[PDB]
Design a protein around this motif. Structure first.
Motif, PDB file in Angstrom:
ATOM      1  N   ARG A   1     -88.173 -12.088 -17.482  1.00 56.46           N
ATOM      2  CA  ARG A   1     -87.655 -10.600 -16.920  1.00 56.46           C
ATOM      3  C   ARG A   1     -87.126  -9.812 -18.146  1.00 56.46           C
ATOM      4  NH1 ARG A   1     -86.279  -9.463 -11.579  1.00 56.46           N
ATOM      5  NH2 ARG A   1     -84.144  -8.095 -11.126  1.00 56.46           N
TER       6      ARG A   1
ATOM      7  N   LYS B   1     -93.547 -11.774  -7.734  1.00 55.24           N
ATOM      8  CA  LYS B   1     -92.026 -11.954  -7.100  1.00 55.24           C
ATOM      9  C   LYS B   1     -92.587 -13.347  -6.066  1.00 55.24           C
ATOM     10  CE  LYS B   1     -90.958  -9.758  -3.425  1.00 55.24           C
ATOM     11  NZ  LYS B   1     -90.469  -8.625  -2.773  1.00 55.24           N
TER      12      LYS B   1
ATOM     13  N   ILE C   1     -87.137  -4.724 -13.958  1.00 54.57           N
ATOM     14  CA  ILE C   1     -87.588  -4.870 -12.654  1.00 54.57           C
ATOM     15  C   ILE C   1     -86.611  -4.511 -11.805  1.00 54.57           C
ATOM     16  CG2 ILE C   1     -88.275  -6.846 -11.032  1.00 54.57           C
ATOM     17  CD1 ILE C   1     -88.730  -7.111 -14.762  1.00 54.57           C
TER      18      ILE C   1
ATOM     19  N   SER D   1     -85.648  -7.809  -7.085  1.00 54.30           N
ATOM     20  CA  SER D   1     -86.373  -9.305  -7.527  1.00 54.30           C
ATOM     21  C   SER D   1     -87.786  -8.860  -7.986  1.00 54.30           C
ATOM     22  CB  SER D   1     -86.419 -10.199  -6.212  1.00 54.30           C
ATOM     23  OG  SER D   1     -87.060 -11.315  -6.660  1.00 54.30           O
ATOM     24  N   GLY D   2     -88.029  -9.853  -8.848  1.00 52.07           N
ATOM     25  CA  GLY D   2     -89.455  -9.718  -9.427  1.00 52.07           C
ATOM     26  C   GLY D   2     -89.434 -10.265 -10.843  1.00 52.07           C
TER      27      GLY D   2
ATOM     28  N   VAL E   1     -92.944  -5.079  -6.442  1.00 50.30           N
ATOM     29  CA  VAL E   1     -92.137  -5.092  -7.547  1.00 50.30           C
ATOM     30  C   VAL E   1     -92.200  -3.684  -8.128  1.00 50.30           C
ATOM     31  CG1 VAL E   1     -91.803  -6.241  -9.749  1.00 50.30           C
ATOM     32  CG2 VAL E   1     -92.507  -7.541  -7.575  1.00 50.30           C
TER      33      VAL E   1
ATOM     34  N   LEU F   1     -96.714  -8.051 -12.133  1.00 42.08           N
ATOM     35  CA  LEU F   1     -95.639  -8.483 -11.700  1.00 42.08           C
ATOM     36  C   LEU F   1     -95.824  -9.249 -10.476  1.00 42.08           C
ATOM     37  CD1 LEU F   1     -94.431  -4.512 -11.457  1.00 42.08           C
ATOM     38  CD2 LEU F   1     -94.150  -6.138 -13.300  1.00 42.08           C
TER      39      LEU F   1
END
Lengths: 33, 248, 180, 52, 24, 32, 19, 11, 19, 11
Positions: B101, B168, B82, B85-86, B197, B166
């Motif tokens: 992640r 976030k 990723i 962020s995400g 993302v 995805l």
């Protein structure tokens, strides 16, 4: 002559699985001999 | 005897627990997509009658380090990380969905897309992604779109089949569960997919644990631990001396 | 001198409480906002800034505080023990008790409401304002008060502490007891 | 073993157990070709496995 | 009295004046 | 009434540290 | 000093807001 | 006596 | 607690089954 | 009677 006997101290106070006391001596703990 | 013996013991006990949390961080330096755990101590006072002299401290986890992990370029098509962020939404063995992640994805014998931990990867319909069994070339997009080439098809028949889900959300609203998956603190909170993302295909995101940051925290827990165990001995020493008030 | 933004940062805790104990600050900037409790005990501060906002409680025990300007918002309590306050301004939004023990306080705002306890212990105040409402315990011990107004409201206990009351309010409903 | 609730408080503190190696993944990336003069050695370009 | 900045062992309430300390 | 509980290290802890069993902590109030 | 009723116990909460 | 008792005389 | 029948010896076995 | 006390007899 109804006595109780055994090795005092550390040897006897281990659990019986240690097998440190001779079996003849260990069997005089229930009042035998 | 004096209650300072247990007041210091309750502090030394927490230092060991804080040491365990730092130990888990250093054991997970090589782990993929691992978010570091923060350790902090909370000061709690025993409120009641008397002078306010006794205050306990307990170690607790205030949060996690959500900074970007180390990216490992591997050249593998099914490796995704990723960008920024995400999260990746996956469902564990039980079935409860959660965020991850770790983008060390793989394809099973039936086409289901899983990750390195075995969690099934969610798709566009909030369902696990099931790709056709006879593939020829998997080419993940930057936005998460999965374009696969059917086996025996010409190179110009490249079509999209799914888009990885995805999510976030706010990082401060997430807690790590008992299996390393981050979930919402508020129960029954839907995980809504994000269109911002991005997935950098061909790379793997490593851990974000700062090795020196844990080491320099270790050397201070040890010193604080040793100071409190000296207090336990000196409280023992005081009581032994005061034993001579009943001699008569 | 006066407190700056950078000097403010060095006297704030994790949850946002400003600690100015024994610090040599004379005046605070106008429109001051505090995230948590405020402590100005033993300070040479003689005046609080206009538009002052405190997210917690104001602590000014044994300080030189003398003047508080109207419009100040205090979420917690106000503790002005041993300070140099002579009068209480009108319109202070107080979310807690008001402790004015051992202060040169002389006058109080009319129809003042105290959401907690009130203290006028050992104060030169001569008379309480009309329509006073106290939701907690009222301590007037050692003060110069000897006559209560026509109407007052105390929802807790009333402690005389030694002073002699001769004229009691005509309209008084008490949730507790009266102690000498 | 009760869990969840307040995970940012001393009551809900959670401690890890370390790390492990779950799988040793084979990276089946196509390799470079060696040109040899022996006529009995063969190669597959693209997907495929010889059968023995 | 004595010390001017003594603490209070009672839990914060913000409504009751702490009488644990010598509040004079 | 009878009052009881585990002495020593376990009881001299903040309640958040749930070392003490729940029913034993109940005994620490009063019983009959 | 002495009193005619037992003293209350000590509160050690992890969050004073919940007591 | 004790079956496994030791003697105080030379063997 | 003075009884009339000698107390039995405690047992510390490896397995409670063979006891 | 302490609720849930251990016993002193082979299970």
């Amino acid at each position: 002559g109804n006595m109780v006997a055994g090795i005092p101290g550390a040897l006897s106070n281990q659990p019986p699985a240690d097998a440190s006391i001779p079996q003849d001596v260990a069997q005089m703990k229930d009042g035998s001999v | 005897m004096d209650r300072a013996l247990f007041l210091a013991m309750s502090g030394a006990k927490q230092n060991m627990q804080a040491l365990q949390l730092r130990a888990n961080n250093l054991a997970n330096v090589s782990t993929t997509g691992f978010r570091a755990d923060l350790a902090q101590a909370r000061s709690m006072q025993a409120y009641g009658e008397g002078h306010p002299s006794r205050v306990f401290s307990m170690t607790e986890r205030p949060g996690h380090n959500f900074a970007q992990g180390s990216v490992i370029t591997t050249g593998r098509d099914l490796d995704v990380t990723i960008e920024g962020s995400g999260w990746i939404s996956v469902l564990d063995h039980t079935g409860k969905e959660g965020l991850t992640r770790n983008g060390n994805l793989k394809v099973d014998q039936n086409g289901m897309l899983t990750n390195a931990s075995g969690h099934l990867v969610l798709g566009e319909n909030d369902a696990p992604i099931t790709l056709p069994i006879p593939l020829s070339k998997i080419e993940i997009g930057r936005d998460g779109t999965i374009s696969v080439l059917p086996q025996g098809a010409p190179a110009e028949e490249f079509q999209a089949v799914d888009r990885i889900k995805l999510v976030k959300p706010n990082d401060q609203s997430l807690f790590k569960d008992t299996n390393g998956l981050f979930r919402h603190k508020t129960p029954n909170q839907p995980y809504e997919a994000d269109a911002t993302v991005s997935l950098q295909t061909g790379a793997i995101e490593g851990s974000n644990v700062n090795a020196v940051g844990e080491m320099t925290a270790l050397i201070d827990l040890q010193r604080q631990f040793e100071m409190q165990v000296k207090m336990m001995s000196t409280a023992e020493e005081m009581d032994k001396s005061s034993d001579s008030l009943l001699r008569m | 001198y006066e407190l700056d933004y950078y000097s403010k940062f060095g006297h704030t805790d994790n949850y946002g409480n400003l600690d100015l104990r024994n610090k040599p600050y004379t005046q605070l900037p106008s429109g001051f906002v505090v995230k948590g409790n405020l402590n100005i005990s033993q300070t040479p501060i003689k005046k609080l800034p206009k538009g002052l906002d405190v997210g917690g409680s104001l602590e000014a025990t044994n300080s030189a505080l003398k003047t508080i300007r109207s419009g100040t918002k205090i979420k917690g309590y106000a503790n002005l023990l041993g300070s140099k306050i002579e009068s209480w301004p009108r319109g202070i939004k107080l979310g807690g008790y008001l402790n004015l023990t051992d202060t040169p306080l002389k006058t109080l705002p009319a129809k003042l409401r105290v959401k907690g306890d009130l203290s006028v212990i050992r104060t030169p105040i001569s008379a309480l304002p009309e329509g006073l409402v106290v939701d907690g315990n009222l301590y007037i011990g050692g003060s110069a008060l000897q006559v209560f107004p026509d109407t007052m409201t105390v929802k807790g206990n009333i402690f005389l502490g030694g002073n002699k009351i001769t004229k009691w309010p005509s309209n008084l409903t008490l949730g507790g007891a009266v102690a000498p | 073993g009760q869990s969840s609730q307040n995970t940012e408080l001393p009551s809900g503190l959670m401690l890890g157990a370390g790390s492990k190696v779950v799988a040793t993944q084979k990276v089946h990336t196509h390799g470079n070709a060696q040109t040899t003069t022996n006529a009995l050695d063969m190669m597959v370009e693209g997907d495929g496995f010889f059968q023995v």
